[PDB]
Structure 1
Amino acid sequence: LPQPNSQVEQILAEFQLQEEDLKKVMRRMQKEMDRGLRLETHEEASVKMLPTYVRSTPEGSEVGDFLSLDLGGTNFRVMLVKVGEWSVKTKHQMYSIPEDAMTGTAEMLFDYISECISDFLDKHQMKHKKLPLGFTFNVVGLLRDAIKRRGDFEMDVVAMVNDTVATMISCYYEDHQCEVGMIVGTGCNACYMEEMQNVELVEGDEGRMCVNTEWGAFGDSGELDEFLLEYDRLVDESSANPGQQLYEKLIGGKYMGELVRLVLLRLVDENLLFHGEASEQLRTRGAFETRFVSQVESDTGDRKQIYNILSTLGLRPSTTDCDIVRRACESVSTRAAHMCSAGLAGVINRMRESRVMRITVGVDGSVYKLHPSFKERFHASVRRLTPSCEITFIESEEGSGRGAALVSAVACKKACMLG
């Protein structure tokens, strides 16, 4: 790599977060999680720490057979599942959606889906049962409505679990040390197994329960204020919910490309990029897509991806411009990974207080899966902040559908247990 421009690096260095800063943030996140878990402060807590009612032990044993419905792009999988003593038995059918039903109203699509479910129930002689059904990936309402509209067979569509909870469970299927689920995509959230005695919103002492942190809300009371840059404040001011979800705004894919756009305009204004002239597309809110960040960071060193991204924005960038854009993208990404690791570090250090603790964390989301070096920087930062823990990270892939089927089993059992 070459000798970097000194004035560009001075602007990009603002994004740096040292260990001490991350320790502060992590420590602040832990206080906020404490507030969320306690009865007396839960209603006022910004970080809600929602009990999911997903317990460490088996419940809802009166659930044998259920349907799992995997909703994909242009098709869907209908699956019959039997849980035994657990022994997950499955059989399934892939259906392709006609363009006829793809291009109609949402009602006509779910009419089609119900028809397919009916066919599947006929094939396996199950139409007398009345099974619970869970979704995997107001589709619920659409399906409830479409089933009622049919009125031949009877079915119970259950409430979905949160996506962090689905992530943790499907990963749990492949690794029983998985006790944390995390999403870094358009938003950012995490769930983990908490001791029952810490979950004050549910009476009970024994075992563990999954808690949905909903930690994106963090920042409400100023916990992030000293870490916010001019670009962050601009993104906040122009958002749908200014002053809310400040943690998520520092991390999620929703605002990542926009932060980069603002860093590039700052550099143009300093006459350090594009000769002090920005295009109209670059001055357009939303024009720099988050997907562009990961494309720019994928570049092998030839600058063809960066040049081709920047050319779609009416810019004619020299090789130096391209290198600057790479570095602007890297600073934003790296900061997101640092902020995210402080949240996860807080959770893992808290769990450790009740147990080398060996733990698996299940992770999903476009930012985490698709961004070139994000997961790596994120891993190294989390591990740095979690002494006396050995952390394994896995992405759910479940190449047979059984992790997905377990997600539906748990959701159906919980719906039953809750009435």
Structure 2
Amino acid sequence: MLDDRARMEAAKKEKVEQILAEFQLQEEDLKKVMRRMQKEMDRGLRLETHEEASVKMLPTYVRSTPSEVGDFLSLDLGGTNFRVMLVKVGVKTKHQMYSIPEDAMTGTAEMLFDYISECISDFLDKHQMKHKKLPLGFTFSFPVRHEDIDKGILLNWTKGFKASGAEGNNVVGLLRDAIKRRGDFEMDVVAMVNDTVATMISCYYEDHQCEVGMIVGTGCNACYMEEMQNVELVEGDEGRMCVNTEWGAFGDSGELDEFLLEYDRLVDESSANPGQQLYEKLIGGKYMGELVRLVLLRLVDENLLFHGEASEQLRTRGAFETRFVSQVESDTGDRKQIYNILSTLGLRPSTTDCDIVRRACESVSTRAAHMCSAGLAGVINRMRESRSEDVMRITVGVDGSVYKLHPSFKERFHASVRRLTPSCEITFIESEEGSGRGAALVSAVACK
């Protein structure tokens, strides 16, 4: 009867909510995370504690103090795909993207950088400029210990990259060697920047108050303009230098242990980098969809979803894409968006199945937005303190598919950051023109 079905639905909804409630973080939990992060940030900056810090706070050699004109080549590795851009500084652009084969990401460094070199060759042919030798900026979206703007060693791969013979080596050297091995073109590699830094610079170009760059895409990281006096790893105390926090590695020394759920442990254990990038694994688009998948599998196991039987596709690693999380939460109310995703995953969902999936998506993405907010709040509060300002007015430049494309992440993230940053006026701007412009603007100064 109607009332039996209604009782069934009410009981099921209550059990789902009890499971999903584990993802909740109170304001005090976020403040606790924020304070621990701030302490790690201070530790990363100091000569005495840098080697023992989980948040490395890497000097970028991008400074506030310093431009050449002409054609500039920009490369981008580490986001999604490999990107080549021609930018004219006098800014006018030209662009091509290349899908990276699986064996290039997990084979040898030689294989990866040969592929990069092959892609540059393709781009130069398309624009009749393989004879041209240009200044090149390399957006390389991984933790790098810099000796200068144009020299730095890869500390470790992140986001599923596994290429052997790269870690501990000069990344600019790896690129130069590959270009030489091919011998098809010549480039002057003048700058290497993180994607956070490329974003901050490109956003700075539009708004001179931009002194923070943040990525919420495949991975999650931020950079900011630190006082040179506080950057102990670089001699000098005049002006500012951009610092790459590598905050994704927060928690890798156990700093998040009490906040980690079974789903987080499972994601971590099945990842290419177990025990590493734990904070990023709570937020990043490489992991968000997978977190949702594991939640759905728990609900299936409890007989709360899909009659307790999951499809082959739902039981496939990585099959619940982060873009599906965004699409599910974009549903207007008719459940059509949710139904389509679940249908393509080989499921036959009921209306309540769809509603439960939405609730699971909201739980994971809300926690991601709130965890991320504690990170940025930490950066912003530290900047306000360091600059001795009663009220700080700052612009944060942002890029990444999670931040840009999720229908709700942005709203939840902004509101939480603002709550956690007293006496701060924060303006958020989006990196509409890609990393390439940021890399080229850096190159235009660096090539001197």
Decide: shared fold, TM above 0.5. yes
Deviation at 1:275, TM superposition (A): 2.2
SS of equivalent to 1:387: coil
Greater shift, 401-410 or 232-241, is seen at 401-410
* CA displacement 1:36-73 (0-9 Å, x = unmatched): 10101111211110000111100xx6888755578999
Give the aligned partner of residue 416 of structure 1: none
TM-score, L = length of structure 1: 0.80
Deviation at 1:217, TM superposition (A): 0.7
User: Considering only CA atoms, is the larger Rg found in Structure 1 or Structure 2?
Assistant: 1
Deviation at 1:130, TM superposition (A): 5.7
* CA displacement 1:263-294 (0-9 Å, x = unmatched): 11211222222222222322222222222111
CA distance in 2, matches of 1:297, 1:22: 23
Deviation at 1:9, TM superposition (A): 1.2
Identity %: 99
Give the aligned partner of residue 265 of structure 1: 297
SS of equivalent to 1:158: strand
SS of equivalent to 2:52: coil
SS of equivalent to 1:153: coil
* CA displacement 1:151-174 (0-9 Å, x = unmatched): 798541234311000000000000
* CA displacement 1:112-157 (0-9 Å, x = unmatched): 9999999999999999996422256999779746865797985412
CA distance in 2, matches of 1:332, 1:101: 31
* CA displacement 1:173-204 (0-9 Å, x = unmatched): 00000000010111101000001111110111
* Kept in 2: contact 1:344–1:382 (CA 8 A): yes
* Kept in 2: contact 1:165–1:191 (CA 8 A): yes
Deviation at 1:214, TM superposition (A): 0.6
CA distance in 2, matches of 1:100, 1:15: 35
Deviation at 1:334, TM superposition (A): 0.4
Gaps of 5+ in 2: 1-12, 142-170
Summarize the Cα distance change of 1:229–1:81 in structure 2 as closer, same or farther, 3 Å threshold: closer
* CA displacement 1:239-281 (0-9 Å, x = unmatched): 2222211101111111111111111121122222222222232
* Kept in 1: contact 2:86–2:94 (CA 8 A): yes
* Kept in 2: contact 1:160–1:411 (CA 8 A): no
* Kept in 2: contact 1:307–1:322 (CA 8 A): yes
CA distance in 2, matches of 1:103, 1:333: 29
TM-score, L = length of structure 2: 0.76
CA distance in 2, matches of 1:371, 1:294: 5
Summarize the Cα distance change of 1:170–1:311 in structure 2 as closer, same or farther, 3 Å threshold: same
Select 1:229's aligned residue among 261, 264, 267. 261
Greater shift, 354-363 or 162-171, is seen at 354-363
Summarize the Cα distance change of 1:124–1:202 in structure 2 as closer, same or farther, 3 Å threshold: same
Summarize the Cα distance change of 1:274–1:38 in structure 2 as closer, same or farther, 3 Å threshold: same
* Kept in 2: contact 1:130–1:154 (CA 8 A): yes
* Kept in 1: contact 2:199–2:434 (CA 8 A): no
CA distance in 2, matches of 1:162, 1:102: 18
CA distance in 2, matches of 1:103, 1:120: 24
* Kept in 1: contact 2:212–2:396 (CA 8 A): yes
Summarize the Cα distance change of 1:330–1:98 in structure 2 as closer, same or farther, 3 Å threshold: closer
CA distance in 1, matches of 2:56, 2:364: 27
* Kept in 2: contact 1:8–1:272 (CA 8 A): yes
Gaps of 5+ in 1: 413-419
CA distance in 1, matches of 2:99, 2:312: 42
* CA displacement 1:79-102 (0-9 Å, x = unmatched): 887878xxx799999999999999
SS of equivalent to 2:279: helix
CA RMSD of aligned residues (A): 4.8
CA distance in 1, matches of 2:270, 2:106: 33
* Kept in 2: contact 1:174–1:403 (CA 8 A): no
* Kept in 2: contact 1:260–1:288 (CA 8 A): yes
Greater shift, 105-114 or 37-46, is seen at 105-114
Matched, 1:15 2:50: no
* Kept in 1: contact 2:20–2:363 (CA 8 A): yes
CA distance in 2, matches of 1:50, 1:274: 47
* Kept in 2: contact 1:12–1:331 (CA 8 A): yes
CA distance in 1, matches of 2:305, 2:298: 9
Deviation at 1:354, TM superposition (A): 2.6
* Kept in 1: contact 2:394–2:424 (CA 8 A): yes
Summarize the Cα distance change of 1:281–1:208 in structure 2 as closer, same or farther, 3 Å threshold: same
Summarize the Cα distance change of 1:218–1:136 in structure 2 as closer, same or farther, 3 Å threshold: closer
Summarize the Cα distance change of 1:273–1:353 in structure 2 as closer, same or farther, 3 Å threshold: same
SS of equivalent to 1:135: strand
CA distance in 2, matches of 1:282, 1:317: 12
Summarize the Cα distance change of 1:53–1:136 in structure 2 as closer, same or farther, 3 Å threshold: closer
SS of equivalent to 2:231: coil
CA distance in 2, matches of 1:372, 1:92: 27
CA distance in 2, matches of 1:136, 1:184: 16
Summarize the Cα distance change of 1:316–1:31 in structure 2 as closer, same or farther, 3 Å threshold: same
